[PDB]
Tab-separated table of C-alpha atoms (C1' of nucleotides) in Angstrom:
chain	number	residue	atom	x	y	z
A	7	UNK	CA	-24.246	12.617	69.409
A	8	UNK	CA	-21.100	10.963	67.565
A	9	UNK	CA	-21.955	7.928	66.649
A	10	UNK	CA	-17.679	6.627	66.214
A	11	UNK	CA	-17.450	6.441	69.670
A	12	UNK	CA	-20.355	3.693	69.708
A	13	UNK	CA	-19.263	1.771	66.810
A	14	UNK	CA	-15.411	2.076	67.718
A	15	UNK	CA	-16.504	0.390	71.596
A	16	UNK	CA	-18.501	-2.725	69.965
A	17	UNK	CA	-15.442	-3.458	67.429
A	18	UNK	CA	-12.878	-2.951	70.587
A	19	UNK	CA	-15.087	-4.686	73.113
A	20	UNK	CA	-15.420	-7.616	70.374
A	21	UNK	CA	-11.865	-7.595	69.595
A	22	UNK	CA	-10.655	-7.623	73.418
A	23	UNK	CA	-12.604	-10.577	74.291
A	24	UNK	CA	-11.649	-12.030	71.133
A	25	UNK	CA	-7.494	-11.741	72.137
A	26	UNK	CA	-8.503	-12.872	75.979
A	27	UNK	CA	-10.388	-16.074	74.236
A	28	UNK	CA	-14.012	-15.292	76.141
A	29	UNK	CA	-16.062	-15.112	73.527
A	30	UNK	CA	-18.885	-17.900	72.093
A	31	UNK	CA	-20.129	-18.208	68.737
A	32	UNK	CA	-23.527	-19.009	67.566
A	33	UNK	CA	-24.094	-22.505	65.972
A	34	UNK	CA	-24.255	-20.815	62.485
A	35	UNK	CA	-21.235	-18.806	63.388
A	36	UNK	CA	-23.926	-15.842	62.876
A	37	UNK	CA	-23.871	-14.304	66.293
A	38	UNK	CA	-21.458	-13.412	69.509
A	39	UNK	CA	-22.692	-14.456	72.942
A	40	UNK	CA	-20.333	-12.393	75.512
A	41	UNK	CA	-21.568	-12.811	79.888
A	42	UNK	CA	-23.704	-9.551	80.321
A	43	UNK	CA	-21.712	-8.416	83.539
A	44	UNK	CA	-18.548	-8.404	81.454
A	45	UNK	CA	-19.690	-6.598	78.678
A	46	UNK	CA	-21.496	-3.838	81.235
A	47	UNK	CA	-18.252	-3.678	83.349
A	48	UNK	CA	-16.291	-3.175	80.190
A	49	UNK	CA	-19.116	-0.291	79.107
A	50	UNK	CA	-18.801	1.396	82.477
A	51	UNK	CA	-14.795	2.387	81.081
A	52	UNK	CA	-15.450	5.611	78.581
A	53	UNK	CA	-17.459	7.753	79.945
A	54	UNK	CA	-18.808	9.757	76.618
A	55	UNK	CA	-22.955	7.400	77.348
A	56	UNK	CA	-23.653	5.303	80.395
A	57	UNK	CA	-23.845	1.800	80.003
A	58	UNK	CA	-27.467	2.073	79.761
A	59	UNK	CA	-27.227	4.390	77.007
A	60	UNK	CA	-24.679	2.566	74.933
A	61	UNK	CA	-26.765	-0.604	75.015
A	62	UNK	CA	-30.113	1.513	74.068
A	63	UNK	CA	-28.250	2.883	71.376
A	64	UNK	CA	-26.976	-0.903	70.198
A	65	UNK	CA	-30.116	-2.276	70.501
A	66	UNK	CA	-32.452	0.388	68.525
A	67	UNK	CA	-29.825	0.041	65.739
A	68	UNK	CA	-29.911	-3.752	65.811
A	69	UNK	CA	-26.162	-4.365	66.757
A	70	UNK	CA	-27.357	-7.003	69.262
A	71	UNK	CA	-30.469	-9.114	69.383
A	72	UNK	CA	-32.521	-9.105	72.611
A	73	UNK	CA	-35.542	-10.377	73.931
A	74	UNK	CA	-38.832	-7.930	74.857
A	75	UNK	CA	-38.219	-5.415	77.585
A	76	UNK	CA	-34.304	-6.696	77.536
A	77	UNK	CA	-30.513	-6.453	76.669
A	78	UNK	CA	-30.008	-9.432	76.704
A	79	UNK	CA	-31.284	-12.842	75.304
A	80	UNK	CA	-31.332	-16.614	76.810
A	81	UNK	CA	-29.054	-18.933	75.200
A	82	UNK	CA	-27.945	-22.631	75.946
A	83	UNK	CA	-24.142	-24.046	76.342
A	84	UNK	CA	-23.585	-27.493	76.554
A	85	UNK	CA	-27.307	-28.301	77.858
A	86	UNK	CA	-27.005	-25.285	80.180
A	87	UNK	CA	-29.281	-22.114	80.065
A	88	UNK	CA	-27.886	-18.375	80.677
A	89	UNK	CA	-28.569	-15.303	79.116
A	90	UNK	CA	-26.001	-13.472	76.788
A	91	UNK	CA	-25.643	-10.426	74.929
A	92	UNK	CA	-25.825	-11.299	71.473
A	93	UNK	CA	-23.863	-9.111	69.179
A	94	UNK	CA	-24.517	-9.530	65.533
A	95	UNK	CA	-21.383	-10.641	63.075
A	96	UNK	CA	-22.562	-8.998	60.423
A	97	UNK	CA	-22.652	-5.843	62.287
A	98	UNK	CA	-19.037	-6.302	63.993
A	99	UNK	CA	-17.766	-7.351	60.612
A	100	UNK	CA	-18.386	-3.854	58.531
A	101	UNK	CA	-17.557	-1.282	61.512
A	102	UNK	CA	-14.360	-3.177	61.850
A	103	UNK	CA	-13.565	-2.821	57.752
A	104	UNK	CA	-14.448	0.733	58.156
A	105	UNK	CA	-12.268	1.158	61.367
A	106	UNK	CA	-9.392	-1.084	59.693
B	7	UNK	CA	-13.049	6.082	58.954
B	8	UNK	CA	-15.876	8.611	59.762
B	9	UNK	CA	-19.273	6.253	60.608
B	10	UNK	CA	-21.581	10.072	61.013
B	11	UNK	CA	-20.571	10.752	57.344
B	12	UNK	CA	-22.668	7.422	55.979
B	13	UNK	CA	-25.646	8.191	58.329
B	14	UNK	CA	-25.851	12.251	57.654
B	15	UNK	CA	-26.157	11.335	53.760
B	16	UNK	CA	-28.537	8.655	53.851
B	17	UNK	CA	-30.736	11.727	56.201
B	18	UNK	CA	-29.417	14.044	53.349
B	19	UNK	CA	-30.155	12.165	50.419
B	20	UNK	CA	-33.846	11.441	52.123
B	21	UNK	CA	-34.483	15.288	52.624
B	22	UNK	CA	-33.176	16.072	49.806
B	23	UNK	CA	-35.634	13.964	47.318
B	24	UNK	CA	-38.996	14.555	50.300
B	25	UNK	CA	-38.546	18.763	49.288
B	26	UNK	CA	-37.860	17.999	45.759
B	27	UNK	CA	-40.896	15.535	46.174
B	28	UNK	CA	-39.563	12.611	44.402
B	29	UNK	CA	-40.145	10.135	47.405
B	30	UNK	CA	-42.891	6.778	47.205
B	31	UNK	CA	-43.773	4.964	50.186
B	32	UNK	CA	-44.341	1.066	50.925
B	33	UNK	CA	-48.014	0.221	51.762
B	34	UNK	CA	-47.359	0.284	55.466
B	35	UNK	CA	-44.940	3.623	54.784
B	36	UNK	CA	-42.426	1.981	57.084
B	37	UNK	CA	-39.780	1.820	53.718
B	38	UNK	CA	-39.238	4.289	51.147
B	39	UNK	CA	-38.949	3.385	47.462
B	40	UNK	CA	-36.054	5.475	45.168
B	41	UNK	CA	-34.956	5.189	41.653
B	42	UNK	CA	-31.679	2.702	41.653
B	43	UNK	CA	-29.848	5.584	39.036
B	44	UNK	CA	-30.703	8.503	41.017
B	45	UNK	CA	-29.370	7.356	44.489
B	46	UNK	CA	-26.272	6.500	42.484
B	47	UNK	CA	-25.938	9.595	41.384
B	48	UNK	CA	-26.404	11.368	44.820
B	49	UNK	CA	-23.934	9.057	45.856
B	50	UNK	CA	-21.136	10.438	43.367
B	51	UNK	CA	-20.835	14.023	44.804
B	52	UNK	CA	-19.322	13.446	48.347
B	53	UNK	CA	-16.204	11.587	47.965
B	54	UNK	CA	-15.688	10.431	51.067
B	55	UNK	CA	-16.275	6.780	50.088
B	56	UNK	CA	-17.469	5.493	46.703
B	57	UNK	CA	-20.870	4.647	45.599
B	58	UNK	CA	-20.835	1.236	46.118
B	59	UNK	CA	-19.219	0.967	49.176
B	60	UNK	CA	-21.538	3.610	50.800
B	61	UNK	CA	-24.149	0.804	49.807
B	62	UNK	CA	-22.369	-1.743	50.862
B	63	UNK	CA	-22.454	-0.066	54.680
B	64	UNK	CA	-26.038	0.696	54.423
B	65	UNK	CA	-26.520	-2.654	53.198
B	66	UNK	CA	-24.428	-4.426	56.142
B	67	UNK	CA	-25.872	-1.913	58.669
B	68	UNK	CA	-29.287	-2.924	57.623
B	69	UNK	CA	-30.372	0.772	57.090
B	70	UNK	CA	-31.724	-0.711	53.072
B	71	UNK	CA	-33.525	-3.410	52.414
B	72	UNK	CA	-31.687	-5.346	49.126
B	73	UNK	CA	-31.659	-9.123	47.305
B	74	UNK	CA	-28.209	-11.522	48.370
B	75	UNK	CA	-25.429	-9.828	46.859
B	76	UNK	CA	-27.231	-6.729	45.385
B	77	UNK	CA	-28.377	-3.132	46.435
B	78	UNK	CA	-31.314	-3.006	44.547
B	79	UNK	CA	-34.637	-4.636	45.633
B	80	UNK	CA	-38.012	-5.971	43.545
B	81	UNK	CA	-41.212	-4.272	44.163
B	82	UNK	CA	-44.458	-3.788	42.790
B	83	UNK	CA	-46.349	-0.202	42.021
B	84	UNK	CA	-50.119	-0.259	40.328
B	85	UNK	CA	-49.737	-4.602	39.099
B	86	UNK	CA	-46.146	-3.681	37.669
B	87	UNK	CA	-42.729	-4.925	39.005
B	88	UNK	CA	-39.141	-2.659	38.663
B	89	UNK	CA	-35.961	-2.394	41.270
B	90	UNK	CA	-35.941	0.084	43.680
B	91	UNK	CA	-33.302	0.945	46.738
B	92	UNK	CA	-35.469	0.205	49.905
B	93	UNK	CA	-34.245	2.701	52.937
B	94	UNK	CA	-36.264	1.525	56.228
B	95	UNK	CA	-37.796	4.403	57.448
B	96	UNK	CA	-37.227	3.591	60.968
B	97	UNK	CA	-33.166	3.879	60.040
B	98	UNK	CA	-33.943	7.428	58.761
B	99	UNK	CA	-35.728	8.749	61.514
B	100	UNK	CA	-33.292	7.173	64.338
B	101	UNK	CA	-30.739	8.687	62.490
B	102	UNK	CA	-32.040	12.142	61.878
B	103	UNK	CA	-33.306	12.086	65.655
B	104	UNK	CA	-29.214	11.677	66.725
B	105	UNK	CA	-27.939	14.288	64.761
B	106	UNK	CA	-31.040	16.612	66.120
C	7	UNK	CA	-59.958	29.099	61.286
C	8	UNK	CA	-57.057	27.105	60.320
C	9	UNK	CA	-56.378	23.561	61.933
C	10	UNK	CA	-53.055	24.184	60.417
C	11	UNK	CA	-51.482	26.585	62.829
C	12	UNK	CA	-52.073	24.520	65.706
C	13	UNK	CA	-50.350	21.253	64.536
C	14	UNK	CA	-47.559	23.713	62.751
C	15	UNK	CA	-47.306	25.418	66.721
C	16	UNK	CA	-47.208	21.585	68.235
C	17	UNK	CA	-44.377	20.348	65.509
C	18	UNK	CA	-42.354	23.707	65.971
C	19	UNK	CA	-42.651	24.143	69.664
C	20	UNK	CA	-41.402	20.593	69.896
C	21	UNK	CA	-38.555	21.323	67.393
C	22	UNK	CA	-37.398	24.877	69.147
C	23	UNK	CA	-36.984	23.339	72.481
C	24	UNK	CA	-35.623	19.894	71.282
C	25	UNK	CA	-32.639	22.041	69.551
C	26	UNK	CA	-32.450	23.949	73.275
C	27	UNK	CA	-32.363	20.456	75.003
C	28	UNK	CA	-35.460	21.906	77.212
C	29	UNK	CA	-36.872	18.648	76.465
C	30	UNK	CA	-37.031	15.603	78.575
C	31	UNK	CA	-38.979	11.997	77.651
C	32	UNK	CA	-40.597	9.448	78.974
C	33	UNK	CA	-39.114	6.025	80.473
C	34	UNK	CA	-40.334	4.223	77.140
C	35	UNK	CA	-39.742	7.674	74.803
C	36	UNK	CA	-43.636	7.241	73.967
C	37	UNK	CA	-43.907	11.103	75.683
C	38	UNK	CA	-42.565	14.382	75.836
C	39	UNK	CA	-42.608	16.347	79.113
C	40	UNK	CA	-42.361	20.125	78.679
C	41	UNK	CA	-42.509	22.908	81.280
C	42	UNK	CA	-46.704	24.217	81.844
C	43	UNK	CA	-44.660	27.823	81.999
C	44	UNK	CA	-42.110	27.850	79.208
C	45	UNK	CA	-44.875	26.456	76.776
C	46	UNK	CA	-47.388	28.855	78.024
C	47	UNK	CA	-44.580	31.553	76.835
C	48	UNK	CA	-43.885	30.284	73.564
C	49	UNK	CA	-47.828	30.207	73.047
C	50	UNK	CA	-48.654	33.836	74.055
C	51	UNK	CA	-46.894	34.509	70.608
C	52	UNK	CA	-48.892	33.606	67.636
C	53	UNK	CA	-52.022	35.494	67.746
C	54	UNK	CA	-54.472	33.250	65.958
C	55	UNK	CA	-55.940	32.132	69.354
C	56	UNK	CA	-55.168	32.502	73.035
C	57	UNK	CA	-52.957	29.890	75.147
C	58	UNK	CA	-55.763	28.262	76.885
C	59	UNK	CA	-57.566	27.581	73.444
C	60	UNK	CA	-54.727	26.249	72.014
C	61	UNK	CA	-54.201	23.860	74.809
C	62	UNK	CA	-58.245	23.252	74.849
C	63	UNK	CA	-57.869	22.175	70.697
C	64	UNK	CA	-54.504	20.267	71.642
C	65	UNK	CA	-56.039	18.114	74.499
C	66	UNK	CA	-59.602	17.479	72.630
C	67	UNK	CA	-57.320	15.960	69.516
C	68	UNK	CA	-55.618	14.083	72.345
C	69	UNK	CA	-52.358	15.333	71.211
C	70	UNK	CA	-51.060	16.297	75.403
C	71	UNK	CA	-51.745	13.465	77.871
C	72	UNK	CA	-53.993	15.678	80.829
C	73	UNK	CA	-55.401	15.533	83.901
C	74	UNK	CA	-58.770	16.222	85.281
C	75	UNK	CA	-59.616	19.783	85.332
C	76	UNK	CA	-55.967	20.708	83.584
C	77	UNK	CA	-53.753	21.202	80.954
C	78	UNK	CA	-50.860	19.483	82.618
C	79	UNK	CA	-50.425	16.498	84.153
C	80	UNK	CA	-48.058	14.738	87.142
C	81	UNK	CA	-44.768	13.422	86.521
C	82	UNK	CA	-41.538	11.875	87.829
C	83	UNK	CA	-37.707	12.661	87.323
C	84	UNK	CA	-35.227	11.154	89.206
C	85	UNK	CA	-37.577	10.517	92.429
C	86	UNK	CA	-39.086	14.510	92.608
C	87	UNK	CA	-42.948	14.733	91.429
C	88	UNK	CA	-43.833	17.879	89.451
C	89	UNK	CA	-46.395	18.637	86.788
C	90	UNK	CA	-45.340	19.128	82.815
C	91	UNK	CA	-47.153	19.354	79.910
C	92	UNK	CA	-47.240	15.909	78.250
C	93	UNK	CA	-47.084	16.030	74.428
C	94	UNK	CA	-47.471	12.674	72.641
C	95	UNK	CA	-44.517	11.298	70.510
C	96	UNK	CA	-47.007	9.693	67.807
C	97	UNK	CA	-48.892	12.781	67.650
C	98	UNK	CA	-45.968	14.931	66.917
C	99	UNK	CA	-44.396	12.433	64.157
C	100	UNK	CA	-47.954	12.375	62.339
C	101	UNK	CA	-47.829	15.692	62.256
C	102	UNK	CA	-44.202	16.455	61.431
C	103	UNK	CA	-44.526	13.531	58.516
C	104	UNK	CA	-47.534	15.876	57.195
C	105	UNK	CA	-44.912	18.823	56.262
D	7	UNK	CA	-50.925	18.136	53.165
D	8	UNK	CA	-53.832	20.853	54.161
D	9	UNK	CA	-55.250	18.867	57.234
D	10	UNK	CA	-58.432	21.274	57.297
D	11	UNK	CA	-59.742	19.627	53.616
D	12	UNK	CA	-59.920	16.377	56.259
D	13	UNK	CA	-61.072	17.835	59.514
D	14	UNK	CA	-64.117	19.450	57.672
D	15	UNK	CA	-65.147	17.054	55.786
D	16	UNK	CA	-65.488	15.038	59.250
D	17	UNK	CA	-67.435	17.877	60.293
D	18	UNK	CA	-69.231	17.743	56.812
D	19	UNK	CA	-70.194	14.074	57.270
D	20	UNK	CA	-71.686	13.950	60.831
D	21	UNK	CA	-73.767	16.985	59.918
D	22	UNK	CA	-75.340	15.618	56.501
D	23	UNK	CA	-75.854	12.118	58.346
D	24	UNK	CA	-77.476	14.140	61.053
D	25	UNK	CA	-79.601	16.188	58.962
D	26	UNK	CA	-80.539	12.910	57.411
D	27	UNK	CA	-81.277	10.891	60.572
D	28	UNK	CA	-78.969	8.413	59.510
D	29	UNK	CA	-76.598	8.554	62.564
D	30	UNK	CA	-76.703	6.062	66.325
D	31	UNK	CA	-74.615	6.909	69.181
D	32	UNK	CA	-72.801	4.793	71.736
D	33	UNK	CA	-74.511	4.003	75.254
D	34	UNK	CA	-72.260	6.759	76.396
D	35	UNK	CA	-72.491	8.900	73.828
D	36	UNK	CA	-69.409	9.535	73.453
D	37	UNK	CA	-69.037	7.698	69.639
D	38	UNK	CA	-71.280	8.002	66.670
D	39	UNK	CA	-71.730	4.286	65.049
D	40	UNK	CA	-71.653	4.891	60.825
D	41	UNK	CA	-72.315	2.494	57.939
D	42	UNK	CA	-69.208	1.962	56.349
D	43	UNK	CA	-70.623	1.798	52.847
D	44	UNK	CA	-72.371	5.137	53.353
D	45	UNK	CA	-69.097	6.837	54.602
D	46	UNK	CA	-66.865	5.355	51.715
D	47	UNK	CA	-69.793	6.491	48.993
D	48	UNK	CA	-69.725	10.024	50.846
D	49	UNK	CA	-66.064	10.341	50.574
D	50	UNK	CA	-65.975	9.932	46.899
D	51	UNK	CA	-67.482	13.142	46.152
D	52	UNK	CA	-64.234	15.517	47.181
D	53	UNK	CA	-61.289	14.845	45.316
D	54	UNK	CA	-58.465	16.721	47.455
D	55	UNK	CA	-57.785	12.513	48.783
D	56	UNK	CA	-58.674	8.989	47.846
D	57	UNK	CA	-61.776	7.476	50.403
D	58	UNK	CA	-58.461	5.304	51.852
D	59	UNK	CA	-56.193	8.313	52.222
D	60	UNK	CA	-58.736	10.349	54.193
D	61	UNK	CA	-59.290	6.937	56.039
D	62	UNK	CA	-55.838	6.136	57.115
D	63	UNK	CA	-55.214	10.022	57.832
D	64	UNK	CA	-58.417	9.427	60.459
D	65	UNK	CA	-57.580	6.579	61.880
D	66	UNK	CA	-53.592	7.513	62.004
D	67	UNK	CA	-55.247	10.796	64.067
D	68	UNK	CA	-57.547	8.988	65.890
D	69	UNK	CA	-60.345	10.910	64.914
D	70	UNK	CA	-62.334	6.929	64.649
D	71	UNK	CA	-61.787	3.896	66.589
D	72	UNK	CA	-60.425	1.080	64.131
D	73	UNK	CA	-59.799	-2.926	64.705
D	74	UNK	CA	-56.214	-3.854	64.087
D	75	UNK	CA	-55.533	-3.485	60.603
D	76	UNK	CA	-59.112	-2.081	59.429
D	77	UNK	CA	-60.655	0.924	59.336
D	78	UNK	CA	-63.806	0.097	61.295
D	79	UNK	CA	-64.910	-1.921	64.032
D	80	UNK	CA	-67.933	-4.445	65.210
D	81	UNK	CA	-70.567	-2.895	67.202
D	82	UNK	CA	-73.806	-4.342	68.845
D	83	UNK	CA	-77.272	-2.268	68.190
D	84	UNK	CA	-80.368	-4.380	69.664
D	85	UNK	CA	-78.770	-7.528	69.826
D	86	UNK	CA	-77.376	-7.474	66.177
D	87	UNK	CA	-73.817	-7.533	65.504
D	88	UNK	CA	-72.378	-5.337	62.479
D	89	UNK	CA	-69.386	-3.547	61.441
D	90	UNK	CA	-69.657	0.510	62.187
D	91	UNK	CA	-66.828	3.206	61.469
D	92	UNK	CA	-66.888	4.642	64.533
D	93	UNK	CA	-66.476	8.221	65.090
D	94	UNK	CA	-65.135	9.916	68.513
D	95	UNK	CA	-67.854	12.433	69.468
D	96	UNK	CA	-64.741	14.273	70.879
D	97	UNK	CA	-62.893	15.012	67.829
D	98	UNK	CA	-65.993	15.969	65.737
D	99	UNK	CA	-66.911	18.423	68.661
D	100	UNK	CA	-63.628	20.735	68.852
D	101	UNK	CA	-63.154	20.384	64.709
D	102	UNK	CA	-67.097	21.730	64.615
D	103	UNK	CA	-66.583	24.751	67.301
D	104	UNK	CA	-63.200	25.913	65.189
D	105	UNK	CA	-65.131	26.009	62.126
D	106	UNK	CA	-68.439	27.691	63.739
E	1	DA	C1'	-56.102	23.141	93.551
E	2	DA	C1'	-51.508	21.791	94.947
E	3	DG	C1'	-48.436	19.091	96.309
E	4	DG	C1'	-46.427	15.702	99.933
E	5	DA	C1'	-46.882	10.865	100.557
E	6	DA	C1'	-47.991	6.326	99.134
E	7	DC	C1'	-49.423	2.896	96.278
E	8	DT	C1'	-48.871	0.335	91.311
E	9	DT	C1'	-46.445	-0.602	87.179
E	10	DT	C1'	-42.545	-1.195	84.151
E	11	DA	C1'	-38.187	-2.190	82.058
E	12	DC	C1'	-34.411	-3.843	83.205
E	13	DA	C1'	-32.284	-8.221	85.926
E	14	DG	C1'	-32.720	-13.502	86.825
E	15	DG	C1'	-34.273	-19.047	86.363
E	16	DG	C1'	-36.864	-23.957	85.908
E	17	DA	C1'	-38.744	-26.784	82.676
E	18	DA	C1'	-40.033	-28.334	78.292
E	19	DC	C1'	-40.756	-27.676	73.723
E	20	DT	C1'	-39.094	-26.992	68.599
E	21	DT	C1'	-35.413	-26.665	65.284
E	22	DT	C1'	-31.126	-27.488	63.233
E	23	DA	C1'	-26.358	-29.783	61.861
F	1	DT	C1'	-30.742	-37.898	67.839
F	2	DA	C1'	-28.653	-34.649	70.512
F	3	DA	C1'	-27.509	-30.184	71.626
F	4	DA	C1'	-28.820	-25.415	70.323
F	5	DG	C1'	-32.286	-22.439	70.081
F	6	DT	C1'	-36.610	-21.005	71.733
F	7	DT	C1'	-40.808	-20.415	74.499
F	8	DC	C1'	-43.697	-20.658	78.362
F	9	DC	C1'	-44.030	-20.162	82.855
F	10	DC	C1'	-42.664	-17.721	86.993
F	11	DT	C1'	-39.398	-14.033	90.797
F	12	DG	C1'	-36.660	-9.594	92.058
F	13	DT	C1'	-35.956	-4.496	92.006
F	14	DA	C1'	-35.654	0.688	91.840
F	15	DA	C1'	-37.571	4.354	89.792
F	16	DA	C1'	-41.109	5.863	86.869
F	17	DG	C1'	-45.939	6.380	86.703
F	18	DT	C1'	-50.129	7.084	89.124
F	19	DT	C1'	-53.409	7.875	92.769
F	20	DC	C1'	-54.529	9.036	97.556
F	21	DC	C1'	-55.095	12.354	100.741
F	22	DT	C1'	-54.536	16.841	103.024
F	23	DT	C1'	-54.424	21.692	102.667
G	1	DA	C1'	-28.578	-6.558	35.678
G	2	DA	C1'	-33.088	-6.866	33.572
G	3	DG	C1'	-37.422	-8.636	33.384
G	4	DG	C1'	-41.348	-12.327	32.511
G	5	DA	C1'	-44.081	-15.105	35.211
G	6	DA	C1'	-45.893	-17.016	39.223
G	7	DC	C1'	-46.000	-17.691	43.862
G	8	DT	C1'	-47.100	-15.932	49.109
G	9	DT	C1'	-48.459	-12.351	52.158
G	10	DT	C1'	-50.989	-8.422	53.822
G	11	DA	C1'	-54.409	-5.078	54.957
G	12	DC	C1'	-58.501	-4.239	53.928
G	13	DA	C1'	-63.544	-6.640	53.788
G	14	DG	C1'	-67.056	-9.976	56.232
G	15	DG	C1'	-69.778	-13.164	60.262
G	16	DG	C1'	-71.380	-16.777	64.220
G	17	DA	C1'	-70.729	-17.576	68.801
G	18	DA	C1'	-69.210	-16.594	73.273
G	19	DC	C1'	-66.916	-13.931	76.385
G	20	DT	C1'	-66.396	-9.457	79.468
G	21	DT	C1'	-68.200	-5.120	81.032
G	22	DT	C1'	-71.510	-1.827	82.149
G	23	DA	C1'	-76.244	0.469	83.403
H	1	DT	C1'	-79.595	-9.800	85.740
H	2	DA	C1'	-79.457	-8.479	80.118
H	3	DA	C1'	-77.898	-5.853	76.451
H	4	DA	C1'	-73.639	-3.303	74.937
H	5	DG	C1'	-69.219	-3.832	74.037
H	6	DT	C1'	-65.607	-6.826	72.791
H	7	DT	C1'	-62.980	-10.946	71.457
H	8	DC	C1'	-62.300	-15.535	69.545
H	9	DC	C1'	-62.895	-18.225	66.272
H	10	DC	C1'	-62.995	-18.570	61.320
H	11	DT	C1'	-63.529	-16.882	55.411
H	12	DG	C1'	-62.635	-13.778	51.151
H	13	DT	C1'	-59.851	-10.719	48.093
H	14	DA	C1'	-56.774	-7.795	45.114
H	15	DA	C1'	-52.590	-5.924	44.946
H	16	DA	C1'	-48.363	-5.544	47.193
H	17	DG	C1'	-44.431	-8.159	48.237
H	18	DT	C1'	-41.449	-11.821	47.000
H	19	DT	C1'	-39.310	-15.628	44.599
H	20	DC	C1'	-38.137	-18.564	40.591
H	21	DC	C1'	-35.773	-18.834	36.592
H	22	DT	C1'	-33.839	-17.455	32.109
H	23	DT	C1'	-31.383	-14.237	29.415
DNA sequence: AAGGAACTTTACAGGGAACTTTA
DNA sequence: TAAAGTTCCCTGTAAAGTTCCTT
DNA sequence: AAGGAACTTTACAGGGAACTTTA
DNA sequence: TAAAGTTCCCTGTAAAGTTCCTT
C-alpha cells in the first residue's frame, strides 16, 4: 500500500549507484540507464514488494520507460547494443527534493 | 516528506468535485478539466505542503497535464478557449486503486 | 425490472470483496477471478431476482468471461487448476464510472 | 446515469424497425445490420441523452460492434458494401426478456 | 459434469542487423 | 558524419491460460 | 497570467478494391 | 467454389486540442 517505501528505493537505488560511479546518462542527460540484473539484485534487498512488484509499480507510474511486454528497454553504448532500465530524471529529481 | 499525502488529495480533491458534480471530461474522458481558482483553493486547507508546491509534484510526477513552467493548461469547450488544471485520469484511478 | 440493480450488485460485489482481499486477478489485470460459492452467497441476498438469473443477465451483457454450459469458467494460480467466476475489469470500471 | 433510459430504448429501436420491416440480420443471425442515418434520426426523439451519448454508452457496453474510432462498421448485403450499426442479437435479447 | 493431464500462449528475459535521429 | 536512439526481425522460459480426455 | 488568433489533430463520417473466412 | 465478412488503401469535416505571439 505505502507508496514511501517505493519512491524512497528509486531515490536510494539512484543515489547508490550514483556514489559507486555505475550509472549512464542519456545523451540529453534526460534519462538513467542502470544493468537490469543490478537493479533486480538490489530490489530483491527490502522485502515490503517483490522485485516484480516494485518494477510493476515503477512502470504503471512512469518512473522508468520500457518497451511492450517489458522492464526494460534496448539502448546503445559506444556502438554496442544492451538493454537497460531506464529511470526517468525528472522523476528521480522531485522524490529526492521531497525526501531531502 | 510523506509521498501518500500528495496522491490521497489529488483522489480527494477528484471525489470531492465528481459528488458535488463540478467535474468536465476531455473528448476521449481520459483527462479531467477543473477551474484553475478552485483547485487552488482545495489546495489551501491541508497544510502539509503549499499550493504550489503540491502542483509542482503533480506536475513533476506527471499526474497533470500543464504548459513549460505553468500549472495551468489551454483547452477548448463549445469553439471557446480558457485554462484549466488537466489531472490524467489514468493517475487518479491508479492511485485510488492503491489506497483501495 | 431495473437494469440498475444488477450493474449496482456487479460494482458492489466487486468493491465488498476487493476491501476483504477475496479477490485475485488475472496475469495482465484485464480479469477478476472470484469464488462460484462465495459469489453465489453474496447473490442469494438481494431479492429482485434469483442467483442463476443474475448470472444468466451478467453473462448475456458479457460482463463474466464463461464456459459452455456454465457460469464459471477454468483457471490457474500458482500451477493448481480450479474454476472461478471471471468478472471483466472493463465491465466493472464502465459501470463504477456510471455512479 | 439511469442505464435502463438506454437499454430500452435499444429494445425500443429493434422493435419499431421490426414492426417496420426495416431490419437484416447477419448470416448467423446473431447481429442485426441498421442504417445509421435511421438510428441517429430515431435517437433524437428522447431527450434523457444526446444521439452520441447513447452511442458511446453502446458501444463502451458493447451492446453494437464498432470500427476503431466509429460507431458503426462496413457490412456486405448481396455483393454491396455499406456502413451498418450493428447490433448484437445477444444484448437486445436479455434487455427484451427483463422488460417483458 | 468434473477435474486430472496436456497442450498453447504470454509476459517477462535475451540478441543480430539495419535503419532513423540527434549533437 | 558518427554515435545514440530506435525498429524490425528473430529465440528462450515458466507459469498462466486453455483444451483434451476420462470419469 | 490572460487572451486573441490561427494552426494541427482527432474521432466521427464516407468508399473502391482486394483480401480472408465461412456455408 | 462464391458471397459474407473484413481489411487495406485512401478522402472529408468540425470542433477539440495546441501553439504563436502580444499585452
Amino acid at each position: 500500500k505505502d507508496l514511501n517505501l517505493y519512491a524512497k528505493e528509486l531515490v536510494d537505488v539512484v543515489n547508490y549507484l550514483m556514489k559507486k560511479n555505475q550509472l549512464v546518462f542519456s545523451r540529453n542527460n534526460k534519462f538513467i540507464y542502470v544493468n537490469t540484473e543490478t537493479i533486480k539484485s538490489m530490489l530483491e534487498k527490502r522485502n515490503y514488494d517483490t522485485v516484480d512488484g516494485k518494477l510493476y509499480l515503477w512502470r504503471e507510474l512512469e518512473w522508468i520507460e520500457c518497451a511492450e511486454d517489458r522492464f526494460n528497454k534496448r539502448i546503445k553504448i559506444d556502438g554496442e547494443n544492451m538493454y537497460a532500465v531506464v529511470i526517468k530524471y525528472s522523476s528521480y529529481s522531485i522524490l529526492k527534493r521531497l525526501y531531502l
